[PDB]
Design a protein around this ligand. Structure first.
Ligand SMILES: [Se]
Length: 299
């Protein structure tokens, strides 16, 4: 059972290179617009305390070098929407897939196409942490790389990487420019806040374990919603709601294990630990699979 990412072909054809002054980072070319973080207009000194409205006025259309492989694009319009730049260009992307812009919720997963100077380099799956950060691989020059999900033929763009926090974690915005969490595109100290474990995801992962043979953790006990939630706060687990119990419905039915019985296995898991053994080959509880991810990787 593997963390597995969406096929990235439809996003690769959207990845361009955007250079303004000395700063160069990645952009997203959909239709006749290129989307990129607004701090492409920042020098390394500007990042300490930028006035973006002021800094953008120093710039005109010809100051922006948008490159899609070997082709330059003529920039014929520029606009700042929150923390993203919108570079109106003359040529519409012939490879523009069917796409939406969505703002996802904490605990939901997505794929990330890591790019460096407009060229894709890797793809990986991750989750939006409850504190609105993501833990990933964003080396120098990965700014502008996007996160997405793919339904059928539609690419739901949900994430654009802007900053690596001083604590090593990453933060960014939706495609409208609004940061997830309380983060600002400024090189200052920013608190991420207490992270928690996505409890609905861990339960979904345990359901994947039962379906794939691993069942040692299945317990005789059961428990109540309130009793389990009391054990959740202690171990920094998201509180389990009835919505979360409903979403785990199809999984509970295919394995014939009630959600509350699975919560009791998790309870003894939280209170006793792995105690040496593994689940699906992992020595710790995995919370980066949503119930939708598990069902997609089963039947
Ligand atoms: Se950046």
């Amino acid at each position: 059972f593997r963390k597995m990412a969406f096929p990235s072909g439809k996003v690769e054809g959207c990845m361009v290179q955007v250079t303004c002054g000395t700063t160069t980072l990645n952009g997203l070319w959909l239709d006749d617009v290129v989307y990129c973080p607004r701090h492409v207009i920042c020098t390394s000194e500007d990042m300490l305390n930028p006035n973006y409205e002021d800094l953008l006025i120093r710039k005109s259309n010809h100051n922006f070098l948008v490159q899609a492989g070997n082709v330059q694009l003529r920039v014929i319009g520029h606009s700042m929407q929150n923390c993203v730049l919108k570079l109106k260009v003359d040529t519409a992307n012939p490879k523009t897939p069917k796409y939406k812009f969505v703002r996802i919720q904490p605990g939901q997963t997505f794929s990330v196409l890591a790019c460096y100077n407009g060229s894709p380099s890797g793809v990986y799956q991750c989750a939006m942490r409850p504190n609105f950060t993501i833990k990933g691989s964003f080396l120098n020059g990965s700014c502008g790389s996007v996160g997405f999900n793919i339904d059928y033929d539609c690419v739901s763009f949900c994430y654009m990487h802007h900053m690596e926090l001083p604590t090593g974690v990453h933060a960014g915005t939706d495609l409208e420019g609004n940061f997830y969490g309380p983060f600002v595109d400024r090189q200052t100290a920013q608190a991420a806040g207490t992270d928690t474990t996505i409890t609905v995801n861990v339960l979904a992962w345990l359901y994947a374990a039962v379906i794939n043979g691993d069942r040692w953790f299945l317990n005789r006990f059961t428990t109540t919603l309130n009793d389990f939630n009391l054990v959740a706060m202690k171990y920094n687990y998201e509180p389990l709601t009835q919505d979360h119990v409903d979403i785990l419905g199809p999984l509970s039915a295919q394995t014939g294990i009630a959600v509350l019985d699975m919560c009791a296995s998790l309870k003894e898991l939280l209170q006793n630990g792995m105690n040496g053994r593994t689940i699906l080959g992992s020595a710790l509880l995995e919370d980066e699979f949503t119930p939708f991810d598990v069902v997609r990787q089963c039947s």
